[PDB]
Point group: D2
Chain length 380, copies 4
């Protein structure tokens, strides 16, 4: 009757996640001055180095040096003894205009409504009634565990916690008629960067007690639950200095933690015309609607695009057999109710607002507000 | 009865794929001198720039300058008028040792057999009987279409084709008792970098005729099949100069094109102890076996790991209802037949051999040899 | 009676000189929008790479990417087969604000007239009546020889000449009562980058005939004059790809070719408040005046500064015994006639005008216009 | 009767000087394993960044990461609150082989004795009997003042002193029959990086009392001597973070502080075949000999070279009228006694020994040992 399922998350100071956060700092910063900015900024993190590579065409004036350093300040990386510091690190800027070849194909000369896609791609959307957030529990708890760490780090409670971390959660489920029901937490993993001077025992206790027991409902915990708390033993070297960091390299953490499917596309660093972002948020929007709106417990939604073309080439809706209504019918309800041309998406989900930096840690989905988490009512 | 499903691939000269190929050039190059090398090399591509960021502990002496430039030579990027050239570009090397903190947690002091994982993570494996390769058709054809382009570029037939390209394939399927049957190709997309001097008409004809009709079985093509051939119109600016490139940013192209699931982990740049690679190939190995070995038409396999721990924390097998035998039974057959500790995987799949550069374009799966595509016989 | 004396120059495509030219491109570009810009931009050239490191506080908006690439376009480096190309190279921008610590010390809150120096330093000025330009012949001819190469390269006459070159000139002098008289050219050296396909003989002939005989008065040439024309034999690999390039590493080429003295300070990349530039041009201005104005045949002038202090700490005038009037008297004539506070210099020599890129090749002295080559009339 | 003359020096933590020191760290490191290494390594320093650009052909295996970081560790830059730290900064390595075009011209196929020059150039040598070191006092004292700072910083006495500093010394001389006699110190300048928490008054006192009075003979100080001690007021931001740093940009500090002449060539980063170094040390060697050996009080010596040619194209000896013997005669004594072909120089001055890092701060001349400071006895 039961199966296991694992998902991971990572903290704000994880080297990949830094880049993701920096690339959206850079995005917000343009959108703050030029709503119709075209942004494809990739960040790379390594010891002492933040580098920005990509394409930007904008009217905004932007101090990348300020934008990056504040981003790294907000993360907590603010002293050499933490293995990284916004004050004294290097920032390289290798940023150009958008390819004029791309410029003409995507966005020159057409109503903002009938804008062609920014690239080709495939994007997925998912939602499940296993949780309030309409997300898998495995990923929801993974995020919350890194969230709690951050809370405890910045409030003082564990001033030995450093910014870099990774959680991983495995849950024992059961199959209820195509839908899934979480039953117990089988294994939690936490590895978090720390100050030299604390011992291992002290950390593991604190993670079991202050983090996990605070975060996981005790109904999902029991005497058989395995804990792997600082499994390595030592994690004083962290962030960029431990491990090179790249934008778009935590795109399963950003979405559904192995559940449903992924199209390949990264989110951070990209304005609305990048359909890797706009369509992906739309597809979430749609899936969450279909569940909340009563048609299914669990749903998967594909879309695909061609560069230069506005409508999608394909739309697919898989409901796992959790729906009375057919597969051609949900397709028709989605079609009645959504306009998945990237230029109409942006109106509905307000995607010119510089709110992207909030998205670049703890998931782009299942989260407090954001426009795409707010389900539309369905007419059918 | 039918649903659509899209998948993309990209050529050898796609800026991401360059990095993936360069990161495995760097990996092979170490493994050629030091079989037990520890390698985490990330490449970044942008106009005139290749950069290497990461961690390497090895006894090998390596001329990164040679290793990269030959990699870029083999790709075809060998003149300024192509938008990139191995002779005259910049190569930056920001490479350090592996974190000693990681070193002690993973691999110091233990039989190579009982080596702990290199990191935490989740990894998926998939196989489907819809094709000979045991892969989805959508992704198989996407790869072949970029493959044909490369053939035609390097043999002279279309000496206007440049290295950068992207294909995308959408197939109309039908559900046969949990399994899937491809029926028709609904939409093909191809966008490929070209010389200034050729016109659009000439290219589109050549793609329809020389590439698609050569690659797609005519049984999957008809008068309703949509073609989007150079949808942008112009693609003279390509490779790194068009678009920044990062290692590990085509990890859905590298695997199953939206089918099954993905754990988040990138492949290129990593030796065997990186379970993002070793377990992922093992999970493919297992899924392909279960199908070829007669137990299922379509199967998905999760595994997860903890950094420092050798055994996996979880193993999951989903067969889509295409199997007579239960879900606890396939689990037991896999367990009887495989040892998913990363240090035993490496023996069975021969993963110290410097064959990784071959993997970094056209998929890591469904491909000619490679040890993980060769199914093990099952005892049960 | 006679002594030898050598001086070198280098072309517009010499890797150091590229940087010097790029750093003044960046300077002019600010001064074009913000006359009171504060600029300390260092450029570094190597294969495929231009990098900008330094400090800039300005109101100007500047596309460094455009500014650099055009600079490299104007040089001639515009194809991969020339070993460097403005289109496809990498440009890294590591540029910050000016240190606020420096900002307060130098320039916040004081009449632009009584501005303190930008740094400490020593600067020299020299002039000699051996030539019309009031410069040493050795250096004048070195420059002209690289100048002729450039003329012949850009007009077609020798389309095998590439941008990188170096000349070197040695002249046999005689001592006339403290002053110097050029007598013969003892040795000329020329090494210039070329296309693969031309032979050595052809080049050497062309250099002897088209360059040297065009440039050197035949009165200074004879049958004993040594020529070293492509002394290496082969110079196909040139510019940044041959040799790393740094701003401020041809500061003896920029000035007097070993004659007189140098204070250590580089010129390119710096606005007026950098006294390494402003005082050095002033000291030239003064020396040229004293000679043209009849008081000496040959003169050397030191000045020094303290960071934050406006007046100079010292002024020295050495006339080589070529002056009727004493050493305390020339000091007094200079003092009567010049105001060497950097903020008064800038008014007199018009040093906010974006004319600096013209200075960054072929010398900052002995040249057509520029304000500092135009001697002031002296009252005494 | 009297004239003023200024000279500057800078500390071990001055951003230029860092690069110079790093480039010789890299040189020594090769010479330690491969005596006949060919090295042209340029370093660039800026906030968080050390970059190495250049050409190296060697059999040595070198961990540039270790070599640089230790170099920066030895300097004192070892915490974020000092504005730079060897632990956490970025090190970029853009290092290639030597141009094969240069390789064939300079050093393939010829007795190590009759090796051609590594490049063209002009180099100067100087010596003066005004001091024991046979150097100008202005520069000797400038160096000692930065030397004392370093002593006091590393021993604890002023643990507020940071690595970055600059001194400047002006001395009132008199002309004794072509030679020079120091009379008084007219102006001393010191600006040194400090901790936030010390006040200005405290520093200025300490510099007057602990540094200057310790370093300058009281015979050269009096009540008229001007002091400019922290002239800016504030210097908390220092090293690379204050000011970009380049190798070879303190080449007047490295030599004679404005006295004599300079050929343009930098020293650090270069093995013996780079005549910018080998000939310059030889010319010092020669000048010091002529003075110590009794033929002159003050002497200047030019040499020049052609790339590929072993003998020098020119040799010049100016003795300022401080010698009984003529100008053609000293030429003949030098010629009798020295072999200025770069491959014979290296034997005599032992220039394959990895002692270069000691040279890269406080001057390459007037210093304790080094082979070129040890005068040869003259036969004449
Ligand atoms: C369109 S780009 C990514 C968008 C990019 N970030 C930008 O600047 O907007 C994605 C890939 O599509 C391909 N591509 C680039 N230029 C293209 C063009 N003009 N038309 C079609 N495809 C293009 C390249 O292979 C490129 O790496
Ligand atoms: C282990 S690293 C990736 C492996 C890396 N490429 C290497 O050098 O082997 C992945 C992430 O795990 C976390 N991590 C780093 N060091 C760790 C340690 N010593 N123990 C546990 N987790 C660590 C960091 O957040 C890091 O980004
Ligand atoms: C003043 S800086 C060069 C000017 C710089 N290019 C700028 O941004 O204006 C030259 C050197 O003086 C020293 N220096 C830096 N900041 C200083 C300050 N606030 N006061 C005095 N000296 C300083 C440092 O050693 C620095 O390398
Ligand atoms: C010889 S290089 C400097 C030596 C260099 N650091 C090395 O790798 O040995 C100095 C300059 O001479 C010129 N040059 C480069 N290659 C040359 C060659 N093969 N023959 C003559 N001159 C050359 C270039 O302009 C170059 O910038
Ligand atoms: K990584
Ligand atoms: K990209
Ligand atoms: K150089
Ligand atoms: K500087
Ligand atoms: Mg990563
Ligand atoms: Mg994409
Ligand atoms: Mg990419
Ligand atoms: Mg991973
Ligand atoms: Mg140079
Ligand atoms: Mg200076
Ligand atoms: Mg400098
Ligand atoms: Mg030189």
């Amino acid at each position: 009757g039961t199966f296991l399922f694992t998902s991971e998350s990572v903290g704000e100071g994880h080297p990949d996640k830094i880049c993701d956060q920096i690339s959206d700092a850079v995005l917000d910063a343009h959108l703050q001055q030029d709503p119709d900015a075209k942004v494809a900024c990739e960040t790379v993190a390594k010891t002492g180095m933040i580098l920005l590579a990509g394409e930007i065409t904008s009217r905004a004036a932007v101090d990348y040096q300020k934008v990056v350093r504040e981003a790294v300040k907000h993360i907590g990386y603010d002293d050499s003894s933490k293995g990284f510091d916004y004050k004294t690190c290097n920032v390289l800027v290798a940023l150009e205009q958008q390819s004029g070849d791309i410029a003409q194909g995507v966005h020159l000369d057409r109503n903002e409504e009938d804008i062609g896609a920014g690239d080709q791609g495939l994007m997925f959307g998912y939602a499940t009634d296993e949780t309030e957030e309409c997300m898998p529990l495995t990923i929801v708890l993974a995020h919350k565990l890194n969230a709690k760490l951050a809370e405890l780090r910045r409030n003082g409670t564990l001033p030995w916690l450093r910014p870099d971390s990774k959680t991983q959660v495995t849950v024992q489920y059961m199959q209820d008629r195509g839908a899934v029901l979480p039953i117990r937490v089988h294994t939690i993993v936490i590895s978090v960067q720390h100050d030299e001077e604390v011992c291992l025992d002290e950390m593991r206790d604190a993670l079991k007690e202050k983090v996990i027991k605070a975060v996981v409902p005790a109904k999902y915990l029991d005497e058989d639950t395995i804990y792997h708390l600082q499994p390595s033993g030592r994690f004083v070297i962290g962030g960029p200095q431990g491990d090179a960091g790249l934008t778009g390299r935590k795109i399963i953490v950003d979405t559904y933690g192995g559940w449903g499917a992924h199209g390949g596309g990264a989110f951070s660093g990209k304005d609305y015309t990048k359909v890797d972002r706009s369509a992906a948020y739309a597809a979430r929007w749609v899936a969450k609607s279909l569940v909340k709106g009563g048609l299914c417990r669990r749903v998967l939604v594909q879309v695909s695009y061609a560069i230069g073309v506005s409508h999608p080439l394909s739309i697919s809706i898989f409901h796992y057999g959790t729906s009375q209504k057919s597969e051609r019918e949900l397709l028709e309800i989605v079609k009645k109710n959504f306009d998945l041309r990237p230029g109409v998406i942006v109106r509905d989900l307000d995607l010119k607002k510089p709110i992207y930096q909030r998205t670049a840690a703890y998931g782009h989905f299942g989260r407090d507000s954001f426009p795409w988490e707010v389900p539309k009512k369905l007419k059918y």
